[PDB]
Design a protein around this ligand. Structure first.
Ligand SMILES: CC(C)CCC[C@@H](C)[C@H]1CC[C@H]2[C@@H]3CC=C4C[C@@H](O)CC[C@]4(C)[C@H]3CC[C@]12C
Ligand SMILES: CC(C)CCC[C@@H](C)[C@H]1CC[C@H]2[C@@H]3CC=C4C[C@@H](O)CC[C@]4(C)[C@H]3CC[C@]12C
Ligand SMILES: CC(C)CCC[C@@H](C)[C@H]1CC[C@H]2[C@@H]3CC=C4C[C@@H](O)CC[C@]4(C)[C@H]3CC[C@]12C
Ligand SMILES: CCCCCCCC/C=C\CCCCCCCC(=O)OC[C@H](O)CO
Ligand SMILES: CCCCCCCC/C=C\CCCCCCCC(=O)OC[C@H](O)CO
Ligand SMILES: CCCCCCCC/C=C\CCCCCCCC(=O)OC[C@H](O)CO
Ligand SMILES: CCCCCCCC/C=C\CCCCCCCC(=O)OC[C@H](O)CO
Ligand SMILES: CCCCCCCC/C=C\CCCCCCCC(=O)OC[C@H](O)CO
Ligand SMILES: CCCCCCCC/C=C\CCCCCCCC(=O)OC[C@H](O)CO
Ligand SMILES: CCCCCCCC/C=C\CCCCCCCC(=O)OC[C@H](O)CO
Ligand SMILES: CCCCCCCC/C=C\CCCCCCCC(=O)OC[C@H](O)CO
Ligand SMILES: Nc1nc(NCCc2ccc(O)cc2)nc2nc(-c3ccco3)nn12
Ligand SMILES: CCCCCCCC/C=C\CCCCCCCC(=O)O
Ligand SMILES: CCCCCCCC/C=C\CCCCCCCC(=O)O
Ligand SMILES: CCCCCCCC/C=C\CCCCCCCC(=O)O
Ligand SMILES: CCCCCCCC/C=C\CCCCCCCC(=O)O
Ligand SMILES: CCCCCCCC/C=C\CCCCCCCC(=O)O
Ligand SMILES: CCCCCCCC/C=C\CCCCCCCC(=O)O
Ligand SMILES: CCCCCCCC/C=C\CCCCCCCC(=O)O
Ligand SMILES: CCCCCCCC/C=C\CCCCCCCC(=O)O
Ligand code: NA
Length: 398
């Protein structure tokens, strides 16, 4: 005999209900902000809303299901399976939304000119609907036959006094552990997580490479410039002008990120001034070419230096934003890996004693807290969400 089980159950139920309240309120706020602000109405945030909708359903459905199944109540085994497995649908939907966000940010930084013609809202909405259908198929797969309903625990069934066709509804009695470990964890969770890690790695490498190319063109522009002011040879000045023209056409085609009329004007003055200094160089007028090339220092100061700064800050904002979204993925893995790792010990080590009950429910509670944290990450790291949060709160609550 030990402590009455209702005492520890009261702690678990209260904590679960506290999580459900916060998960609903915070993610309702996220959906409200995107509905309200057109600046937040882009393809990237449609998956953020699909992700927020999954977390609302954790508080509205998954946590009540979790409280129910903790009692071990008698139920038809396939009704028990739906109660046990529905949270796997919502978690799989979250993985699809996170994977789509990473790929979306990869397309945006790799092919900026082709982004809006390739990634549209209509295609995004279709991708979201397909991912929700696949999430139900993956998460509810044990209902298709991969379950332990055919091997019921008759000791627990008779102890709790279940009827005919009923089982004591406990998670590890109806859901097989080889599904949870091989199918759910390895194939459906671990593999997509590693792919997300690789995509974001490709995002950060692409940004670092584009910034280096921008810096390379810039110092190449100034290096040949100081070289022209030195060489007493006309061909030596022509050499610098040619390696100066390539870096000009390079940086021009490098960063367009019509309305950018200055970018064409500022670069047409530059390339046109270089071509002028070239015709002087070919005709042997060395000091006339050196004097013409000194005009570049004005076009550079009045146009080219302004495009480099605007291009660098655009890439730094993309890095900061992809860093914000990668935190979402890291907090997801942090909240869900303990449960998966416990299942591995249960499955792979039959000589190990089972993890204690209090640790099992701490891992369950921890996985539910993930449906609370994302709105905080948005509020702290994305200014457009933070500002829209204030407007909603100050005006409609206060
Ligand atoms: C629109 C929303 C609120 C619908 C909610 C659907 C939920 C509450 C319904 C749909 C299917 C239902 C389950 C289907 C069958 C069984 C087996 C029975 O032996 C115990 C009840 C149980 C486990 C039901 C519990 C309630 C249930 C899970
Ligand atoms: C936070 C994330 C990244 C890491 C989480 C580490 C957790 C999940 C690990 C660290 C130590 C592990 C425990 C150490 C040893 C045992 C005893 C064994 O008989 C059952 C499993 C059990 C109880 C392990 C369960 C999982 C465990 C608690
Ligand atoms: C990036 C990381 C977190 C991926 C997940 C690592 C997992 C798959 C690894 C880390 C620690 C490992 C466990 C550590 C020790 C044991 C005890 C052994 O008797 C059975 C296997 C088992 C239970 C391992 C299973 C696999 C395991 C859980
Ligand atoms: C948040 C901090 C702690 C929450 C810990 C919550 C987890 C506590 C579970 C303790 C327990 O024994 O749960 C028994 C279970 O309800 C029997 O059916
Ligand atoms: C279970 C609950 C699911 C609740 C789902 C709530 C879905 C809200 C979606 C939403 O608000 O979408 C805004 C849209 O992006 C503006 O154009
Ligand atoms: C239980 C949740 C049932 C599925 C709810 C799916 C909601 C998907 C969604 O809200 O998508 C809106 C989209 O962002 C608009 O463009
Ligand atoms: C919407 C309202 C549903 C809210 C109802 C939530 C609780 C329904 C289940 C319930 O009341 O359980 C009774 C118990 O099983 C008796 O034997
Ligand atoms: C908030 C909704 C809490 C639902 C808890 C519940 O319905 O538990 C019934 C239990 O299974 C009856 O044996
Ligand atoms: C949807 C929101 C809450 C529903 C809560 C989940 C439904 C809880 C079902 C309770 C139940 O079916 O328990 C029957 C009990 O065995 C009879 O004595
Ligand atoms: C809302 C969707 C409809 C909800 C349907 C609820 C079905 C309840 C049910 O199927 O009860 C099974 C039980 O085993 C019978 O004795
Ligand atoms: C895409 C996914 C389509 C998946 C479609 C699966 C439709 C078959 C599911 C089914 O019929 O299940 C029967 C019942 O649940 C067994 O007890
Ligand atoms: N193993 C497990 N158990 C439970 N609940 C049952 C906890 C339990 C375990 C042993 C026992 O004797 C009584 C209760 N929920 C669970 N959820 C998950 C899970 C969801 C996603 C990944 O792992 N695993 N999981
Ligand atoms: C917020 C929740 C505050 C409660 C925290 C600790 C109180 C002690 C509860 C520990 C439960 C142990 C019961 C058990 O292991 O079965
Ligand atoms: C379950 C609870 C979850 C609620 C989902 C939140 C939905 C929020 C916004 C979508 C609905 C917008 C329509 C409200 C009226 C709009 C208006 O006044 O113009
Ligand atoms: C709405 C939730 C109201 C309070 C929740 C009741 C908890 C008791 C229980 O679930 O067993
Ligand atoms: C609309 C439905 C979209 C799903 C159809 C595409 C592939 C079906 C096979 C997927 C494997 C199911 C497990
Ligand atoms: C627009 C977002 C919402 C998209 C529609 C969501 C509806 C998906 C519902 C059911 C999909 C069917 C897959 C269910 C698997 C069968 C298992 C079973 O029920 O026995
Ligand atoms: C285990 C794998 C990842 C968990 C650790 C990553 C968490 C760091 C990012 C989130 C944070 O800053 O708190
Ligand atoms: C909190 C960290 C829990 C790790 C120790 C688990 C206790 C145990 O092994 O029984
Ligand atoms: C958080 C951790 C508090 C719950 C852990 C306490 C273990 C209790 C085990 C026991 O009651 O013997
Ligand atoms: Na989620």
């Amino acid at each position: 005999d030990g402590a009455p089980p209702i005492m520890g159950s009261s702690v678990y139920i209260t904590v679960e209900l506290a999580i459900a309240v916060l998960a609903i309120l915070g993610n309702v706020l996220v959906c409200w902000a995107v509905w309200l602000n057109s600046n937040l109405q882009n393809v990237t945030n449609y998956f953020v809303v699909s992700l927020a909708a999954a977390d609302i359903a954790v508080g509205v459905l998954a946590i009540p299901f979790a409280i129910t199944i903790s009692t071990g109540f008698c139920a038809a085994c396939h009704g028990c399976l739906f109660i046990a497995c529905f949270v796997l649908v919502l978690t799989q939907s979250s993985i699809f939304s996170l994977l789509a966000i990473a790929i979306d940010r990869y397309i945006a930084i790799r092919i900026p000119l082709r982004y809006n013609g390739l990634v549209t809202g209509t295609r995004a909405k279709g991708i979201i609907a397909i991912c929700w259908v696949l999430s139900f198929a993956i998460g509810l797969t044990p209902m298709l036959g991969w379950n332990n309903c055919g091997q019921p625990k008759e000791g627990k069934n008779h102890s709790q006094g279940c009827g005919e066709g009923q089982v004591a509804c406990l998670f590890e009695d109806v859901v097989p552990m080889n599904y949870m470990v091989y199918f759910n964890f390895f194939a459906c969770v671990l593999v997509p997580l590693l792919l997300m890690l690789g995509v974001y790695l490709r995002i950060f490498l692409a940004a670092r490479r584009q910034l280096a190319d921008l810096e390379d063109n810039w110092e190449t522009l100034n290096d040949n410039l100081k070289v022209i002011e030195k060489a007493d040879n006309a061909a030596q000045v022509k050499d610098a002008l040619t390696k100066m023209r390539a870096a000009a056409l390079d940086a021009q085609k490098a960063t367009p990120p019509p309305e950018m009329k200055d970018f064409r004007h500022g670069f047409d003055i530059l390339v046109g001034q270089i071509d002028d200094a070239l015709k002087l160089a070919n005709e042997g007028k060395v000091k006339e070419a050196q004097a013409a090339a000194e005009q570049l220092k004005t076009t550079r100061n009045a146009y080219i230096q302004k495009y480099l700064e605007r291009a660098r800050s655009t890439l730094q904002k993309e890095v900061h934003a992809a860093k914000s979204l990668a935190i979402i993925v890291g907090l997801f893995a942090l909240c869900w890996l303990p449960l998966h790792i416990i299942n591995c010990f249960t499955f792979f080590c039959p000589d190990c004693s089972h993890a204690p009950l209090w640790l099992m429910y701490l891992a369950i509670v921890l996985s539910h807290t993930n449906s609370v944290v994302n709105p905080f990450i948005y509020a702290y790291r994305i200014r457009e969400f933070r500002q829209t949060f204030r407007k909603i709160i100050r005006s409609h609550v206060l």
